């Protein structure tokens with residue numbers, strides 16, 4: 001019954017296959033193939049569909065797979081360079097039939113994404129009973145939707161005893177919204193049903209989609225012996241009762257937003273887990289036992305009770321939170337909680353645990369602690385001999401992923417660009433990824449079209465020039481000077497952007513923008529650039545459009561002036577559904593002068609608790625005559641979960657509204673210090689708790705604001721008053 005066929009004949013061949021047959025798949029690249037598979041083996045003799053040699057059967061293009069029947073194994077498929085058109089990439093069902101006792105192993109899904117970010121769907125969907133998903137490598141999902149979900153819609157899908165083991169769940173970048181889980185087991189609608197799913201011996205590496213790496217929303221599951229290495233997320237016991245969390249390793253290595261386990265519901269056991277180097281806070285914390293809503297509806301937060309945590313090791317964990325989430329709705333503290341024989345070791349002077357409500361429901365027995373201070377809590381014992389040295393390699397040596405599967409730098413090439421009609425446009429089109437475009441002479445670099453950045457490129461002014469090369473737009477249809485699309489990564493330095501507008505030609509739509517729907521995460525670095533003469537209110541010099549995302553945007557040493565619109569806009573997600581477009585934005589040593597719109601506008605709206613960002617740092621910026629209209633904001637930072645504004649100067653700005661505006665949650669980490677505000681609007685927030693470390697009101701004294709020199713004169717009271725002893729505002 002052994003056959004060696006190509007993939008197109010698999011469906012009819014699998015139907016004719018009998019128990020024990022082996023169907024070998026010829027090597028090749030199959031494009032636009034929707035496999036609908038049905039086969040029936042038996043417990044002693046399964047039907048094995050295998051790549052003739054694994055790792056050389058490529059399923060590309062508009063493709064997906066559906067599997068139903070009994071005792072059918074599929075081995076050695078490689079999904080890449082394509083996208084699923086309808087459901088998931090792999091489903092354990094086919095029409096109305098499900099797959100039982102089937103197995104998908106030694107397969108790879110590798111950046112199986114479409115070209116537009118504005119879609120949502122899964123990659124692997126589990127149905128039926130007693131199916132196994134093992135030794136697979138899944139990585140690179142760039143759009144919304146959980147990577148792998150266990151569905152419990154029908155009785156045939158519940159009490160599944162599905163085994164998700166020895167897989168490598170690789171990089172999943174920050175989605176910027178809810179819906180970026182790597183694994184979800186159940187939903188709120190079937191939460192109190194038993195799923196009996198086993199997730200064991202898996203490797204979660206850089207699974208950073210959202211707060212939940214694994215979202216358990218069903219009952220009586222087992223999550224054991226997994227490794228979460230540097231994941232910006234947690235294991236969430238979100239819905240359902242009696243889940244077992246045993247022998248897992250949460251290895252954050254001191255990286256940001258790394259967490260462990262967040263607990264809701266009743267009856268769980270958390271035993272023998274390693275919590276190592278976790279920096280996450282609140283819902284990202286190393287450990288969290290939530291407050292709950294009394295008599296909660298199915299989709300809210302149910303009472304945490306009858307939970308035993310024993311023989312866990314909390315090594316260098318920043319935040320261990322009891323009653324986390326307490327507010328006017330989640331008013332019910334955990335009850336009948338037992339911490340037994342746990343080990344707490346930390347080198348930092350953070351609290352052992354933090355409580356946000358009464359913890360009378362907690363019992364502590366024979367816990368041992370080694371912190372830099374003496375713990376005087378009943379049920380804890382200090383031991384200064386405990387070492388925070390841990391042997392992590394037993395977690396790093398475990399075999400995971402497909403057996404045959406293994407796995408932003410310059411080229412060094414520089415392209416000189418003279419001035420002319422389209423010198424920069426043709427230099428970019430001749431450039432490879434990693435090339436440097438060196439504008440070699442001063443003058444006007446005209447552009448009839450946008451510079452489309454679909455690769456990694458660096459555009460710089462030659463270091464010998466004494467003035468910034470000026471970019472001007474003389475096209476017939478409105479575009480931005482630079483447009484980042486799929487695959488683009490941009491560092492730009494020393495360039496001036498003049499959107500003046502030419503006679504008889506279209507107006508430019510901004511300086512740098514990222515095309516909406518761009519599915520590849522992009523990096524943007526702007527250094528010593530200039531933006532001016534954009535004279536419509538709806539434009540921005542630098543804009544991250546809706547349905548785009550960057551993990552890191554850096555803007556430094558730049559000059560934004562004489563514009564009717566904004567300078568930096570990352571406020572496109574206006575639907576108040578928790579979405580945002582930049583994880584970390586850093587603004588350094590920038591001048592904002594004579595703008596009708598905001599110097600900076602970042603927005604994340606809604607009450608969603610599923611994300612970490614955006615994070616913002618603003619340092620040594622000078623804001624002069626910016627956004628004085630009624631209810632304007634010189635800086636609009638709504639929903640920024642972490643903001644640090646330091647060593648800045650606001651003058652004659654925000655007079656009709658606010659110089660800096662927040663609409664913050666009480667737990668948002670906002671730090672506004674060393675700010676000079678002269679004849680400017682107030683620093684506006686909802687709770688009024690930003691404090692007032694070094695808030696001055698001196699009159700700034702520029703060297704020569706007419707020639708663009710906004711440094712302070714040496715005798716100005718803004719001199720040497722920054723926290724780093726440099727100048728308030730731009731400096732050095």
Ligand SMILES: [Ca+2]
Nearest residue numbers: 178179212610
């Ligand atoms: Ca979620």
